[PDB]
Amino acid sequence: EMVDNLRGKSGQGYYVEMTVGSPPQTLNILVDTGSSNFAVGAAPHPFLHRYYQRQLSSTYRDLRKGVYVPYTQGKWEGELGTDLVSIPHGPNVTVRANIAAITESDKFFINGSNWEGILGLAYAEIARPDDSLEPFFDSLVKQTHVPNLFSLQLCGAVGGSMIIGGIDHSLYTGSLWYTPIRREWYYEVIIVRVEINGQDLKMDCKEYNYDKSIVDSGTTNLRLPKKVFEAAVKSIKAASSTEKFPDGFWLGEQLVCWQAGTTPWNIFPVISLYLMGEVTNQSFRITILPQQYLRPVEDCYKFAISQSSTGTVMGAVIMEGFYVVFDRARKRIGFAVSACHVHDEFRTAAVEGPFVTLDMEDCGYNIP
Ligand SMILES: CO[C@H]1CC[C@]2(CC1)Cc1ccc(-c3cncc(C)c3)cc1[C@@]21COC(N)=N1
């Protein structure tokens, strides 16, 4: 009933259908594990298919508070209020949630996209304008019997599933391996080892998490810290030396093209991230393929691994390989091989363990 409740377009994210107010107003809302506000278009911005009309809802309540949100890539400004919210292809429930009515924005909405809002699924600490503004999932858990858990199956070329309040076993193969949530703000995790085609980058594990590592469905790329990215590109270049590519390509400043149906996947290496496990000195590894990190542009592809100054971001390139369980009740994140992941006859995405790794806690970054 919740299976295939996500739709999308390549590089434009994944959205779920939601209803807001009384009578219900249907809206397509972007699923974002890297933010914590429920913010919807509330004015006729030309890129919008539809928007939330507060004057048409008898259950709308004004909080009489503004919210101004600049961010690296843009800005949004809204008016805070509460209303009745439901997910038609989710649990049979209605909650009173905080809604930020977007009244002004810049580089927020996408020209040609089918979503009109963002559902922030992370914790209160990162909510705007402060942690006193209760996020949607927290409201859903407080007002209903829905278990404090959700899982995501993002399927690359788009569709997928958001299982609210549970795990659907048919969406994954093999076993789920759990990594602890380091702190409840973003979905912060610890990377203890990085391998390119089984070859360790041999870096101080603190570099992998400088200044944080997060699981973010609202990001397309696998974002790596500058020093880690340099070492990863150097190794990927070496493993794929059988072909040449301008530098701009590895920088995402230009595209690479092959004649159709002939892309040389085997020349490209596998990428492995070892994550902190449940028990002391134990890790597991997640492995992704060039099918995840080479993103088709509509056979032309973009290198979807990029430099970052905000730490590791496990975006859509990571998540598309895997069934991801956001186990909020147990403060952990589960990973299992996705039954919908894109692969070939030679290599498959993998979740393997246990491994023995020492000093895993030394890998977290802490402000001096
Ligand atoms: C509280 O205000 C926050 C500020 C930051 C944004 C969310 C709301 C704003 C925003 C707008 C669009 C997209 C997006 C565009 N295209 C494709 C994808 C997949 C997503 C992502 C985001 C952000 C920025 O990063 C994350 N994770 N969400």
Side-chain angles (χ1 to χ4, degrees), residues 300-332:
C300 294
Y301 301 88
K302 182 185 231 172
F303 183 57
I305 302 164
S306 77
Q307 232 159 21
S308 173
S309 54
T310 56
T312 298
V313 186
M314 288 166 59
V317 336
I318 288 296
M319 290 183 74
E320 276 159 20
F322 307 105
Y323 182 60
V324 187
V325 174
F326 297 77
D327 188 354
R328 299 156 58 90
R330 291 182 246 192
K331 208 187 175 195
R332 57 184 199 172

Side-chain angles (χ1 to χ4, degrees), residues 134-172:
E134 182 177 85
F136 173 81
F137 210 79
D138 295 77
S139 290
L140 179 76
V141 167
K142 280 195 180 194
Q143 287 161 53
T144 73
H145 291 280
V146 173
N148 195 18
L149 196 148
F150 70 87
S151 47
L152 290 165
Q153 189 208 48
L154 313 179
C155 307
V158 310
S161 309
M162 179 167 56
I163 314 300
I164 303 140
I167 293 164
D168 191 305
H169 303 303
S170 73
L171 299 184
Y172 72 89

Side-chain angles (χ1 to χ4, degrees), residues 11-13 30 32 35 37 69 71 76 108 110 115 118 128 216 218-220:
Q12 289 191 3
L30 180 93
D32 183 17
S35 73
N37 285 80
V69 192
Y71 57 95
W76 73 267
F108 186 80
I110 303 163
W115 54 263
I118 298 187
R128 304 279 150 92
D216 183 2
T219 299
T220 300

Side-chain angles (χ1 to χ4, degrees), residues 58-165:
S58 58
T59 52
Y60 164 76
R61 301 181 188 164
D62 201 331
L63 277 169
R64 284 185 63 181
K65 203 154 128 177
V67 60
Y68 189 91
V69 192
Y71 57 95
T72 301
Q73 295 261 306
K75 72 111 221 175
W76 73 267
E77 186 182 19
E79 296 175 335
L80 296 164
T82 65
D83 215 334
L84 293 180
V85 183
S86 87
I87 302 150
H89 301 287
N92 193 45
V93 292
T94 305
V95 298
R96 175 158 297 272
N98 285 313
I99 304 170
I102 306 158
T103 55
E104 199 180 302
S105 67
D106 180 74
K107 301 194 239 76
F108 186 80
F109 299 119
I110 303 163
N111 195 18
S113 110
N114 202 28
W115 54 263
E116 304 92 50
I118 298 187
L119 180 63
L121 291 172
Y123 302 92
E125 216 213 89
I126 59 161
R128 304 279 150 92
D130 38 43
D131 60 330
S132 74
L133 197 88
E134 182 177 85
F136 173 81
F137 210 79
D138 295 77
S139 290
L140 179 76
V141 167
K142 280 195 180 194
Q143 287 161 53
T144 73
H145 291 280
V146 173
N148 195 18
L149 196 148
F150 70 87
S151 47
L152 290 165
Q153 189 208 48
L154 313 179
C155 307
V158 310
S161 309
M162 179 167 56
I163 314 300
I164 303 140

